[PDB]
Design a protein around this ligand. Structure first.
Ligand SMILES: Cc1cc2nc3c(=O)[nH]c(=O)nc-3n(C[C@H](O)[C@H](O)[C@H](O)COP(=O)(O)OP(=O)(O)OC[C@H]3O[C@@H](n4cnc5c(N)ncnc54)[C@H](O)[C@@H]3O)c2cc1C
Ligand SMILES: Cc1cc2nc3c(=O)[nH]c(=O)nc-3n(C[C@H](O)[C@H](O)[C@H](O)COP(=O)(O)OP(=O)(O)OC[C@H]3O[C@@H](n4cnc5c(N)ncnc54)[C@H](O)[C@@H]3O)c2cc1C
Lengths: 453, 454
């Protein structure tokens, strides 16, 4: 048919864009290669986070700092956790399916799509035209270029979350947050974990205090780390042995029962034949867009993980809505990602919003930093867990908050406030003027703001 | 020609805050403490209640959780260990509070009970002391109700219960406030049948209806017994193993218990002060009256903290202490701004309020517009498999500015801080929709609540 807007994808960006597009009264189509919903609902956020909740519960049941308690944690039936998880993602995706019946405008086309023309695509054999296109194809697990991994029984973020047999030992190869979250997940479920990465600092992109802190907590909990490693080759023997490579000038090997690969996530632009539609691709295989989400083709827009931006679901939905506003309705709204929060749901949780110290220096600010150890926050003390940090990056001249970086329990709830401070230009003085609830983690912010001479 | 520049009666949050801010001005100050240094929050109040609450939450999650594959269990609790460890923690913490005894080498710790004998002098331990300025940060103490028989009875208070080292098989709580809820749920999670009794027909009468209904639903779901709308007539005791209660809704009923906790209120400690000898006004509820600057009827006597029967929180006490010091020392005529005070009831689910309720905003004259979001709509609550709560949003229909936020959810005390920033600095619901919210966090609820306006 001659659609008004054709969407390649079914993720958060595809859904936000489809809704906002039907609001304008346009006939739209949703082309999905596989299972509807995208990554976050089925193989991404939701499963990881619910399983992480279970793991945190059993971890507190097995080892807690309070003496009088007589708690214990037995062996885990992972099959049950995974089946219940799948029931939850199915229920949730079903709560997302209210958009097929309702919004009775858009048409669900199932199949792999490829571009054949500047205005038409081909899927499952048939051709489809449209006045506007949205490429919200997302990203998929990326692989490293290390010997032996080719023919090997390795797991990815998606495959590990299907495993129904707890490995006695799991090795993670990844510098990102997914490797940490899944690693700690299986450590709390009863498994000796070994994190391996080439970067010499845990979470290389964060501030030094954050890396040192989260690393200290991870080592304290019992996760083994292998930093600064140079990966040469990996081998497998009878599905009951693994391998590793040199580190710090000494050839070492790490045998494991399972191997997880968390290198990165590559955009799914290969099968699109973007060159047949005049859509430029970047050095990292992404899709290039302008401030309005428009590609080199005037009537093809892109949003989500496929555009190498902050690979988060909320950014994907935001970008979808804005892009739709630009393509349909003409409203020239720019994509504002100047303040995007990031949460690594380990315990202690890592959380960032705004600029780091090095980033604020690069931007040209006259930076003033204040670092507060978690043992200074009352809530961390009464909880008898004080491994963390609150970092505050401000402008020494105007006192405006440029960035907040936290390592503490449920820090994902605190950085929202920090976001409000950064976006709306609140000063540290403002943070001291506001009353903070005693024995909450948010109090950390105030206590960090009370660190300027 | 006097003994001190500023003399403080008390050692609580207000006393220390005022001492710090006063030494900053370079003034000779004194701290008169009747008993144990640190005040209520460190020794008998916040810190103990919340650390024990943390333990109780841990054991409760160990005994009952919604995730199937987990095989966790929780045995009988050794309360003695929890209480001794608690005391070790408050000792460590008060010891960290002593850093002000040397870092701020100005103030002098005088120990003894003080009473006023003149408009400008006090008496402690026999000796008299003059000062150009006075701060009455005497705090509050557990109050008792007017019900027959409780006078001669082995009842517990907020301070005594935190010392109990034997888990009662059944504990009855008499209180409409948050302390009763916190301690009640604490001992419920420690393995004890709890029964909350109050005269108000709605849990937390001052909060919004949805908040009361929700938190009540969670308490009943957990297994806490509630007795609302009760008229308290008499209570009896027999051999330290039996208790009593009174009629409710027109049917005389009785609640037998192994222990009885009283959380009615907290009376200011103004009796032993002889304020009438210094010309300091007291209110109908035995409090100390102050103006907008914290100044009493006596020009050179200020007051701050719980004795000033205002929002009875430690952060409000410290704030009031600092401001009062600014007024008395330094002359700066700064008013006490309590227009945005957060409140947290650290039960699970946690209750959290900041700003105006719906009825309060209507009374103030606003054209109110509310948005209520059930907790089962928040992703983080869903993945956690605990969805008993609510997000209520009170806004101004004209300017869309956020007037108040009220939440019932896990660790909601961390979220309302954001809400505070929204209320204090006049952010609109549209502003909350413009901001990107982290997925699978409870703070996201705020955004989801802002996305409910037609
Ligand atoms: C383990 C894990 C944890 C994560 N945790 C978080 C988190 O905590 N917070 C967070 O914000 N983000 C998280 N993410 C990332 C998040 O899932 C993504 O940022 C988000 O889903 C992006 O949405 P999207 O629409 O852009 O792409 P996607 O949601 O991935 O959707 C892509 C869809 O496009 C389809 N498709 C692909 N190629 C084609 C083609 N050629 N033709 C037709 N259809 C095609 C696919 O079948 C898929 O359904 C996580 C990811 C993983 C793997
Ligand atoms: C169980 C419980 C839990 C609580 N939880 C919280 C919470 O979570 N958050 C929160 O914000 N607040 C909480 N509070 C309240 C909080 O502790 C108080 O509001 C706060 O301590 C008030 O500080 P203050 O200095 O005004 O009074 P206080 O801290 O009580 O200080 C009073 C001091 O004055 C001294 N004094 C009294 N009379 C005399 C006299 N005649 N002469 C000399 N000295 C005298 C006493 O020795 C005492 O040390 C809680 C209270 C209780 C009981």
């Amino acid at each position: 048919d001659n659609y008004d807007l054709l969407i390649i994808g079914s993720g958060a960006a595809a859904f936000s864009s489809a809704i906002k597009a039907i609001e304008y009264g346009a006939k739209v189509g949703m082309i999905e290669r596989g299972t509807v919903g995208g990554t976050c609902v089925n193989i991404g956020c939701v499963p990881s986070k619910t399983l992480l909740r279970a793991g945190e519960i059993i971890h507190l049941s097995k080892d807690n700092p309070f003496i009088g308690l007589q708690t214990s944690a037995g062996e885990v039936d992972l099959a049950s956790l995974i089946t219940q998880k799948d029931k939850l993602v199915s229920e949730l995706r079903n709560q997302k399916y209210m958009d097929l019946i309702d919004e009775y405008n858009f048409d669900l086309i199932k199949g792999e799509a490829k571009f054949v023309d500047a205005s038409t695509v081909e899927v499952n054999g048939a051709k489809l035209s449209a006045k506007r296109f949205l490429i919200a194809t997302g990203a998929s697990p990326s692989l490293p270029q290390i010997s032996g991994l080719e023919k090997m029984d390795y797991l990815t973020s998606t495959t590990l979350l299907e495993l129904k047999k707890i490995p006695k030992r799991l090795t993670v190869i990844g510098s990102g947050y997914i490797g940490m979250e899944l690693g700690q997940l299986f450590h709390h479920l009863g498994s000796e974990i070994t994190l391996m990465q080439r970067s010499e600092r845990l979470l290389k992109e964060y501030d030094p205090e954050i890396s040192e802190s989260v690393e200290k907590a991870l080592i304290e909990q019992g996760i083994n780390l292998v930093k600064g490693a140079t990966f040469e080759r990996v081998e497998q023997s009878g599905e009951i042995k693994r391998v590793y490579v040199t580190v710090n000038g000494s050839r070492e090997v790490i045998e494991s029962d399972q191997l997880l690969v968390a290198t990165g996530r590559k955009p799914n632009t290969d099968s699109l034949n973007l060159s047949a539609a005049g859509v430029e691709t970047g050095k990292n295989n992404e899709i290039l867009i302008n401030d309005f989400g428009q590609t080199s083709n005037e009537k093809i827009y892109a949003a989500g993980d496929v555009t190498l931006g902050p690979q988060f679901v909320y950014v994907a939905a935001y970008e979808g809505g804005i892009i739709t506003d630009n393509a349909i309705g003409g409203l020239n709204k720019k994509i504002d990602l100047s303040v995007v929060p990031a949460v690594t749901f380990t315990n202690p949780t890592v959380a960032t919003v705004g600029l780091t110290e090095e980033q604020a220096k690069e931007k040209g600010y006259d930076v003033k930093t204040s670092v507060l150890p978690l043992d200074a926050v009352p809530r961390a003390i009464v909880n008898r867990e004080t491994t963390g940090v609150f970092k505050l990056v401000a402008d020494a001249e105007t006192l405006k908050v440029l960035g907040v970086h936290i390592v503490s329990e449920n820090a994902g709830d605190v950085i929202y406030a920090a976001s409000l401070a950064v976006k709306f230009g609140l000063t540290v003085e403002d943070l001291t003027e506001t009353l903070a609830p005693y024995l909450t983690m948010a109090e950390g912010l105030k206590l960090a703001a009370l660190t300027f001479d």
